[PDB]
Design a protein around this nucleic acid. Structure first.
Ligand SMILES: [Zn+2]
Lengths: 187, 159, 104, 53, 75
RNA sequence: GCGCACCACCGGCCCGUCUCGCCCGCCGCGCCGGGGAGGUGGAGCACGAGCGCACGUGUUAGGACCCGAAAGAUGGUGAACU
RNA sequence: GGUAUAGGGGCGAAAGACUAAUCGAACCAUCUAGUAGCUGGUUCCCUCCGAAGUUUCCCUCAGGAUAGCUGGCGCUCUCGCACACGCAGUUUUAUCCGGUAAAGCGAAUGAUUAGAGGUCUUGGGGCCGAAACGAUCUCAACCUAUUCUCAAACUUUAAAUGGGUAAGAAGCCCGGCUCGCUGGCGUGAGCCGGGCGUGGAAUGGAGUGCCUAGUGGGCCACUUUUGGUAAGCAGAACUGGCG
RNA sequence: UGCCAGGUGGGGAGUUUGACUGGGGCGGUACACCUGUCAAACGGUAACGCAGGUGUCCUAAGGCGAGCUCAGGGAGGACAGAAACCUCCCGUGGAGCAGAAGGGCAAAAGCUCGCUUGAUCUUGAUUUUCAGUACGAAUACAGACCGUGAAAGCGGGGCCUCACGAUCCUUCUGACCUUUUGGGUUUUAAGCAGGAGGUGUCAGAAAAGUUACCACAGGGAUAACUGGCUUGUGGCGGCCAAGCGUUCAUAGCGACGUCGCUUUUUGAUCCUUCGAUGUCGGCUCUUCCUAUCAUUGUGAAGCAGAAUUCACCAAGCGUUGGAUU
RNA sequence: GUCUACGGCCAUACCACCCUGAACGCGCCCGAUCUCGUCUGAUCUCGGAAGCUAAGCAGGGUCGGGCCUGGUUAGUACUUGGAUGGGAGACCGCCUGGGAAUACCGGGUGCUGUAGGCUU
């Protein structure tokens, strides 16, 4: 006879990756041991990000990684990205880097190796710095997907700039009553 | 069903009190308001332009915009699912300064004074307010005169 | 309602306040060659009877009178429609009523 | 009935499309037949180019 | 076949099931709803804030030097 | 202290539109073209995240979870009863 | 017995009668698995969470859409890893809001009883009078001090309950810049640099983004209350239950 | 005769014949809006609840600046009287502000004057039903042209709360506006922006009846039976006592008031039943109730006998034959 | 002690009657040429300083009316929450907290800001 609301007693956070691939599970075991032994929170963050789904770890662009490493203070530090590193074609000068990532695109890998940089996997990063010392943790833009453009306040509402679900943009598919001031109203 | 009129049910709210009709006093006109000032809204029947809605009567909000002779104020209104902070434009006569924040500001100044003081002395002074404590047990002196006996009054039909 | 035939008001082309001649607005002919009229005729032609709905549920008994104001100053002559609230009695220059007189 | 921000679409399945559904289970057989016909024509025109004029 | 017209019996319980909250207060609120002349003046001031940056930097350096001298005198 | 991702805000940029205004170019000097500042509208830019396949749920068009009408149309057969 | 009239047709001394046990539109096949907001049914186990009959719109009222109630997927952070920010059907401290209960009508408006002083003022019946405010009362509306009873659409007053706020770092104290706004100097706002931390009680880990089934017939009970004589009647407000 | 055009054309064909509703129909609009109450002192809140109002009107009844105070009452002055005109005083608004009501207003927001059309044009922001979407209405601003006053200032309609309308189509206005398709010119047409023509079932179908010849999918959400709560009404019984009763309230009655009982009448509700509970009477038959017509036993009188009504225990036994319907 | 000009709170300031005002000041008051507007210099405007506290105004008084603030009314009316409390009901009582308003009886009858005067 106790009044406790069991509505949110079960936490929905992930515990193991849903992927059935074996290399990711081996990395999960390694970082589980590292997080439960070492006092560093870097291992815990890396394990949590490894648990995340594909959409929750967007790819990181080479230009974004370059601009994040160019910040003063993180000189000679290894970049740790749980997603994938993708080449950026609109950048010419690429300094040498120390990048740790699950995957790297072929073009980005060629660019980094030609620039004189070094690319490491997560097991190599664990062997080098078990507690993640001298590491810069980076991630891609979470809201970069076009899916989030359709989220938020619904269209046809004042002060809303949400992209509606339209079969094909055009003159006679929208921008009519509800959007034109000359036809009914607008928001 | 009831009508959705703006001034429906405001027979007594938007009405001046007894022996206080006539010309509006000029202190309300000649008192200033700044941004972020806590102000309680009270409608006035004499002035109709810029009159706030009946739902905002008695509600208190902060000032965010000040026009020539009106004030933009954000107030919290609860409508059946949630509380929304919404901004309304209210003329000067329908607005008053709130002393609730002034009472807290005075206590803040007292705390600053009492922290500047008693610091070089080293004696830490109690700054936090405390609820009503026990009544600090004391002695009651019955000097000579004994306590007065109270006999219940017998019933009698008066009316 | 009563309105004067002259009204000094804002002019879009001139940009300043100038006098305007005031007239009441009336509907013109359909000219028989509008796109909607042509579509209506081509749809009504042939068999099938009446295609478009016919409004037979009139309720109100007045129209919003529209004032056409023509700029008096030459070289502009800019017309502009001005709307007024509903009224079932409209006139221009109609007997300004001579406030302070007798009634017989 | 629309439900919480779905795309407005108009499927063109109001006719008797099931009677006029055209399957493609004969695609590999058709490819084999075309290949055989092409080889037969090439063997017919022995010194002439396979592609043609 | 008359039905019930209107009631709000369970509405309070429905509201409080999710725990209705006050609106999210965030610092640096939006400037929507401010008079256009004031907005223009603030925009001009922000645009011209870059003017006289060296004077502000020199004044800050002088203030830092004064504070350093004061703390050296204190110690 | 450098400050990922993300939120709030301030600025900046692109296109449509309004207002005030001053100058630029020429193969054709004109009912030419270009540029500024200040508001506003856009599903926009602001160092990217999409494409293909598979699975799950929800919404529809189709027979459409299964069975159910009173009706309508097309073409044929009945005066062996009446 | 033969023959002629075949289905929106035939035929009918007329009953909507007959037309192969069917006739207010015969029978067979096809469109056709026609449509149904309406009935009925909807197949194994365990575990966890777990509702609504409410908002507004619809020729809407046995139904949908939209919010609400609900589930799932997560994500961003704090930490019993001797070292905590924020949030609340709570209370307390100060500040405002109300016009209901109550009370009043010797105070405004409306109703209303009865006596005293009033040719206040006029008028009707009357009696003493040709009449007379000359004496006598009376009934009519009014007054001067009183008196009896009232008001959901009255109120000078006026609670209990209740509704917004503030109880600090997103705050104070200085120094300097910008302003095409405002001004005599000044404002006011925005920019940068520096100094000061437990800001009433008690309990809670919080915030955020999407996919989203079902529900949109309710009923009962303490208290308040509308119509009705009353109703296991109809219709409302808070809370709690059945559902 | 062949083809167009106009008229006639339930002979024939297709279809429609709103919604709420203490069943439906009839009656009304509670269908779009506004005022006070309902409404329980934030707000919001139902009924075919109560009292009402609206689909107008205004070139002034809008906007300024100035001057006066209104309704009413008293005292006075030739015609002149209760009401014509003039003067003095009192006069918190008891007048007026267009309407229905509420709020509000006194060197006004009222009346009279003088000038005027801020009832003009254009971006946005916000408020009321809100889903926090439109429409309508409204509030602070801003950018131009203005009106008025000496000026501060006020005014982009009416002192505030109501007076109104989506898509499509048509019509008018505006740009030295765009396209009109291979290029060029001109009519025409299609475009952008701002008004109007209207959907009163007022978030907006184009819409007459009957069926007793009827049909189908459903509903006891919804009626006509019974039975359920209540007893207004019907029937029956008490309490007080002004009087009727020749005298005398209570032998028998009983006004003005008031308290109850019954479901053997009609009412109200729709709780059970619309995949069916056979819908009035009469005949036959059994049982039960007393609110007792008569019989048994008694109390009472305006009970001399007879006759008689009033009351008590009391349902054991009886409560008939016919004309009409 | 007090007056004028501009005010703030708007009756403790208002209303009725009586008494007193030394000086400045506020006004009454004298005229219509000029400015100004009316049927009338009545109001307003203008040009003045022969008379006055007569009046306004200021101060005081009324066992004054009213107004403001207290006691009484009264822990009464009412009211949050509670009970397997009473009663046939209408209603009432108790526990737990808050707490009114008339009649009736006391006190008071404007404070104050800026600038400029008089009693030097
Ligand atoms: Zn012009």
């Amino acid at each position: 006879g106790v009044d406790i609301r069991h509505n949110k007693d079960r936490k929905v956070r992930r515990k193991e990756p849903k992927s059935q691939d074996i290399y990711l599970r081996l990395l999960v075991k390694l970082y589980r041991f590292l997080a439960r032994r070492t006092n560093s929170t870097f291992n815990q963050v890396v394990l949590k990000r490894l648990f995340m789904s594909r959409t929750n770890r967007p790819p990181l662009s080479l230009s974004r990684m370059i601009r994040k490493m160019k910040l003063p203070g993180r000189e000679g530090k290894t970049a740790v990205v749980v997603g994938t590193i993708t080449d950026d074609v609109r950048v010419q000068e690429v300094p040498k880097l120390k990048v740790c990532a699950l995957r790297v695109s072929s073009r980005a890998r060629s660019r980094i190796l030609k620039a004189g940089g070094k690319i490491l996997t997560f097991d190599q990063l664990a062997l080098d710095s078990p507690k993640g010392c001298g590491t810069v943790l980076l991630s891609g833009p979470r809201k970069g997907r076009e899916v989030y453009r359709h989220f938020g306040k619904a269209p046809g509402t004042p002060h809303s700039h949400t992209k509606p679900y339209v079969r094909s943009k055009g003159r006679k598919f929208e921008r009519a009553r509800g959007r034109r001031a000359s036809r009914g109203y607008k928001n | 069903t009831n009508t959705k009129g703006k001034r429906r049910g405001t027979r007594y709210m938007f009405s001046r009190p007894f022996r206080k009709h006539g010309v509006v006093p000029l202190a309300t006109y000649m008192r200033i308001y700044k941004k972020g000032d806590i102000v309680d809204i009270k409608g006035m029947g004499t002035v109709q332009k810029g009159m706030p809605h009946k739902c905002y009567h008695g509600k208190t909000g902060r000032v965010y915009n000040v026009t020539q002779h009106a004030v933009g104020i954000v107030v919290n209104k609860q409508v059946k699912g949630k509380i929304l902070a919404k901004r309304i434009n209210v003329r000067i006569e329908h607005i008053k300064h709130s002393k609730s924040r002034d009472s807290f500001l005075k206590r803040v100044k007292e705390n600053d004074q009492k922290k500047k003081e008693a610091k070089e002395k080293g004696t830490w002074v109690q700054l936090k307010r405390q609820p009503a404590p026990p009544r600090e047990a004391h002695f009651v002196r019955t000097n000579g005169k004994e306590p007065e006996l109270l006999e219940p009054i017998p019933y009698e039909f008066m009316a | 309602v009563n309105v004067p035939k002259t009204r000094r008001t804002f002019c879009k082309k001139c940009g300043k306040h100038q006098p305007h001649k005031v007239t009441q607005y009336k509907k013109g002919k359909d000219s028989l060659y509008a796109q909607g009229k042509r579509r209506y005729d081509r749809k009504q032609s042939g068999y099938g009877g009446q295609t478009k709905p016919i409004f037979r549920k009139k309720a109100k008994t007045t129209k919003k009178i529209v004032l056409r104001l023509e700029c008096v100053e030459p070289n502009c002559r800019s017309k502009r429609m001005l709307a007024i609230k509903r009224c079932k009695h409209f006139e221009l220059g109609g007997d300004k009523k001579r406030k302070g007189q007798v009634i017989q | 009935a629309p439900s919480r921000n779905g795309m407005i679409l108009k499927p063109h399945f109001h006719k008797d499309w099931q009677r006029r559904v055209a399957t493609w289970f004969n695609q590999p057989a058709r490819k084999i037949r075309r290949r055989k016909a092409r080889q037969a024509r090439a063997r017919r025109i022995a010194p002439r180019p396979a592609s043609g004029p | 076949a008359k039905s019930k017209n209107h009631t709000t019996h369970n509405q309070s319980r429905k509201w409080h099931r999710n725990g209705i909250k006050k609106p999210r207060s965030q610092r640096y609120e939006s400037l929507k709803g401010v008079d256009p002349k004031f907005l223009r003046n603030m925009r001009f001031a922000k645009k011209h804030n870059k003017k006289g940056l060296k004077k502000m930097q020199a004044n800050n350096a002088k203030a830092m030097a004064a504070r350093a001298e004061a703390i050296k005198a204190l110690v």
